[PDB]
Design brief:
The structure is a homoheptamer. Chain A is an all-beta fold. Chain A has one domain: Distorted Sandwich (Leukocidin-like), CATH 2.70.240.10. Chain A has no helices and 16 strands. In chain A, strands 6, 8, 9, 13, 14, 15 and 16 form a seven-stranded antiparallel β-sheet that branches. In chain A, strands 1-4-5-12-7 form a five-stranded antiparallel β-sheet, with no helix packed on it. In chain A, strand 13 and strand 14 form a beta hairpin. The radius of gyration of chain A is 23 Å and the shape is elongated. The interface between A and B is large, with 35 and 52 residues. Chains A, B, C, D, E, F, G: It is found in: Secreted. Chains A, B, C, D, E, F, G: Its main location: secreted. Chains A, B, C, D, E, F, G: It comes from Staphylococcus aureus. Chains A, B, C, D, E, F, G: Keywords: Cytolysis, Hemolysis, Secreted, Signal, Toxin, Virulence.
């Protein structure tokens, strides 16, 4: 774009790490302060790296003939900001890209899409939802999968199994590396501030989220049928981090 | 092109952000002022970044047997200028590219095309129209899709469904990331000015647009038939941004 | 080429913009003056950017049973020069490329080709003619398409239609982005001048052209048959731009 | 990401090599100390090169009609840290990537995956598990392969063989070059420390591991049936390496 | 190659342009003089750019039942040198490349080949012959194409046509862009001269040529049969250009 | 890796060439000495280039009805080191890569693998074994190929041949260029030494090897049956090269 | 390789051109002298550019019913050196690459191979032999092609032809551009010399060669049968060039 039209400062960085031991959600708020004499506004490029655990474990089981699985079905990152504050979000990467395909029809569908919720001048939010995953190398099953006899086959290790339900669940490692051992949101977003702002200080509200699912699964005496109730439990890790743009620094 | 024929300044930048809370449309007019001693004219490379929301919501419903959906079917960006003013649009990116294919025939058709309306020396306009989208992994349906029995299948979640029409609509996330959570135009265009212009000041009219569509859908007691009336409602976010080329700055 | 044989100045630029409001034909003559002490001749790299309108509109119609369509089928750019003047065209981009294919046979055929008419030492001219376009996702129809019953299917929206001929024409946006909203020729060419030339001044003739075609289409009471007469109307935007090689500047 | 948003010190490295002759596990802990005036925290990029041997050998056998094979089915690298210590792991490469495929369905499956276990602010750990491998160019067999008649065909050189079981095992070189002559982890992870930390010294717990498998295989007088007991033997190699951030050096 | 073995001046340029108005053969002799202290011999990289017209026109016709077509089938550029002169040709780009294919068999075959005739220490010459071209999207016909009933189908617009032979020939634009509007050679060659040569002057003979072919085509009262006699007419544009290596300049 | 975490001296080389005329094994030990102030240990990057001949010749024959072929099956290169010496091998290139394929199953298999035997802190060893080769464009035969009637078809030029066994062997050039005219090992390995080592001198044991194969082939009066006994003859070229890290030099 | 292990002078060139007018064998011996203070030995990179003619002509014929064709089937470049001299060849480019393919089986096979005969410390020699070529777009015929009825189909223009054998041979241009107008070797090899060598001078023996083949072809009164006797004629072009490493120059 730059060369198509024949067209040809000290930055302060830092990092803040915190860990929610109860939820096991890693946090990473890497940042860099940018000031430009030509630019009429101050800058701060926020890197939203880190990781959110998978916690693909059997939370409990109702005996050997019925068991449930607590696993994550949608991750999110929503760097929301109070509307009272005058801090402006300028740009954010990645940006929702136009879908592409070929025409018989074919296209690429990643298991964990990377969508970006319609932001505003205050709140910027993603949603790394679960599209579909393949079990037993047979069909990319999604959350909506359901069968009259087999029920949901989201993680059914064996159709006509004879083991304990808490032990006959699909191996976490045979599936993707996002549920078994977590997903690592590595996103970014820049916020700009007035050059002649009175208060060179706002509040950054970092809110990591995820959508755990309760996948109750039981034997119908002929095959294993499971039911999944979306958003059975949700875990949020809110956190407020204050900046000092006068000193070009943000701390816990 | 440059090397094919054996051929081998201080720039002022800035950014202006505004938000239409009623229409929920982000605005972004990032820019840079370029002046060259060799060039005989002044420059201003205008970046047209930002985002226009989708607002893919059930605006109203006529009970459970008939409902309508308000969703966007065409986005636009038209940086128009009054014909009285002498500001000249020189070049703009992207430029309408020549279609290509292979010959049986195959080609690539993005869901949201990026067309450029025939500009002039005053107004430059694009139109990111909706080409076609795939529902239930079966056919890239377009706005013109219609069936004698099934009607339009643009967002019919279930053909022979039995749920409420306001609840049996296709999931926003299963479709593209443009309708559900907005589309983010990232365009550019340069306007050049006379070196010896008497008044180093004009008015930039940024007009973000979009075409919401009313898609009424109802059960025919056998299957769901929907009808879409194009351009039922349109939303425009016009705004005038005055420049100071003498100071090489543009403000709200 | 350079490295295959083991082998390892101030330039004045500018731009001239003009617009033909009658024909809607944008003009752009971006340029740069190059002088090299090692080179024995002066240089001027002329860039032929800009755009030519499509004007894909129903110019008139003979009622609802017969209509004609005014659309462009061949654009051109011919930077000609009077033979009296001693200005020499040295090189021009693009240059006619050798066709390639694979051998069953397959190759790529663009909708709007970019041919280069056999130039001379005075006149250099391309011709962006129309090769073929696909309608209703069925066959890449060309100007020569004709059927005994259906006639020409170049822009027939519906074969056995029942709407008005002025309203039952193919949507401009469903076709390519060249006829509907214009095509943007971005060409280039360098002319070199004698180092010891007596008069450091010539006349550059920029002639943007186009060939509108009359696509008369009518209902045969069974299906819509259309006829196209090539070169029914042509529009030229000639313009002379004088150079000052002594000052290394060209003005209107 | 950096350029999408229009945005445009002395480091001390070192070396520490040790070798466990009993288990034959090579170790390499290449590193570099980074300090930045703009950054508010100290840095240390730890590289986890080296190799873990394969030891694809017949540990013992029960006559010629029954034999077992000791071969590695999962490697690991777990740079853990005591929770008492305040040393913070910031980022780690590689990061679990989102799975990709095309839709008939197709995707790529490496034999030795590279998963990353859900870490915390103290412990970072991989798990290079075995996905699936192909024998006799017929099917990518995995650890879970089992047949009622042929048993497990994981390394069965000949189905209806007649040689000694300790001599009729699949050649180590015909399979991948990981089991036969070892797998070489080349991973990394960076740890950050407080700029005003009282004690500039922590303890790096490098624990190389692996999961050797006992593959008992015997002749059923008609064909060879084998049974593999996962995690039959494990060979951890713990090690503590102390750092001196005040001197920016780490030693054994 | 250079880095595979672990291994890591003022140049005078210029150009000479001339045109043959009778034959329409453009000439371009772009060059550069290179002298190196480490090199023991002088250098001159001669670039053989330019264009040779196609003149794909009906030179004459024998009424409407028989016509001939004057079209070029072999272009050449032979920078020959008298054997008396000691000017040495060292290297020349392009150099004949080894053919490649895949094994069913497939490969790429350009329409207009670029062969390099076996040169010597004095004479260097290419030959841009015609390989094959496709008509009516049916078969890549070559010069040797011949049929007992249809004759040569090289440029037969319609097999069982009824139009005038001077008007029922294949459109020049539907075929390749080489015969219709000329072919533009972009060649090069470097000649080296003795550092202690007594006479720093030789004679460069640039000879652009062409081999026009007569394609007589007539109606056999059932279909159009044509015959092509190779090398019917040839046109040569010889030219001698003297060098001044002492001044490192070459002029007309 | 480096840029994924937002992270941004005099070297003495040399040469040592020797040749074993009896075995025809060329040797090249290109190297470079590296010392870094930030590094706590010295470095030496040893390059294992050179070439080992193929000697694909008929060593002897038992008349015309039975013959043997001496052709190579492995080119081992084992730079070993005595365990008494404290010279440490840190890293070595190439490092065994994880296999890749697509899932019907497909993958790539080179004829001459480049395996890396499980090394230690003293010894680093490769083994360029033969995977499989294709004869008569029919099947990638390996050393394990055997047929009840045709025997081994490894280099059987003609199945039902009638020529002399010493003359009816497959042409060396029709197979790969490795057996016929040698394989050229171009490998490397870096060794590090203590900065405060008392003795700055060790011994590099370069041992070029090879595993010739005896391919006895005879006519069974109906077809040619051959037998190959692996490791029939092996040839070694041991050599000791002493380093002087104090002078940063290594000689024969 | 270099960066995989975390690791980050005046040169005299020249020219020497000679030509064998009898055999038409061009010669080019481009070179560069390299001396490094860190290197313990001197260097000289010899480039083997130039070209060898093809001479694909009818040397003689036996009437119109039998003819022979003198065409080259193997070119060679053997930079041999006397064993008495201590000039050491260290490395040479290209070096034989390991074959690759995919597994049904597929791979790439060049028409004109570029083999490298097993060299030594004195002699380095290639052999540009002919692999296979395709005639009439039907089968990649090789020198070994033979048929009981049609004989050898290597250059048989027409199977059941009726023209003169001296005139019914395949066109030289329809085949590859290597036999017709020569093959152009572009090889290289570096030789290293002792830094403290007493005599800084050796003898470089450049020997261009070729292996012409006599392809007799005659009509069997039903079809043309051809026979090719390999290595019928060879035309060696020996040449010795002396170096002066003390002056870092090599001349004729």
């Amino acid at each position: 774009a730059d060369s198509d039209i024949n067209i040809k400062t000290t930055v302060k960085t830092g990092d803040l790490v915190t860990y929610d031991k109860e939820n096991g959600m890693h946090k990473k708020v890497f940042y860099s302060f940018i000031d430009d004499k030509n630019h009429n506004k101050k800058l701060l490029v926020i890197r939203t790296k880190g990781t959110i655990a998978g916690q693909y474990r059997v939370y409990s089981e109702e005996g050997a003939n019925k068991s449930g699985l607590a696993w994550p079905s949608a991750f999110k990152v929503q760097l929301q900001l109070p509307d009272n504050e005058v801090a402006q979000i300028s740009d954010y990467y990645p940006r929702n890209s136009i879908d592409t395909k070929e025409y018989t029809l074919k296209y690429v569908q990643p298991d964990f899409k990377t969508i970006l919720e319609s932001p505003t001048d205050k709140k910027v939010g993603w949603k790394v939802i679960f599209n579909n995953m393949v079990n037993q190398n047979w069909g990319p099953y999604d959350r909506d999968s359901w069968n009259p006899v087999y029920g949901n086959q989201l993680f059914m290790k064996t159709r006509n199994g004879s083991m304990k339900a808490a032990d006959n669940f699909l191996d976490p490692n045979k599936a993707s590396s996002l549920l078994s051992s977590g997903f690592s949101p590595d996103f970014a977003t820049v916020i700009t501030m007035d050059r002649k702002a009175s208060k060179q200080q706002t509040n950054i509200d970092v809110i990591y989220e995820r959508v755990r699912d309760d996948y109750q699964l039981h034997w119908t005496s002929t095959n294993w049928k499971g039911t999944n109730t979306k958003d059975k439990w949700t875990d949020r890790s809110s956190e407020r981090y204050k900046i000092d743009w006068e000193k070009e620094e943000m701390t816990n």
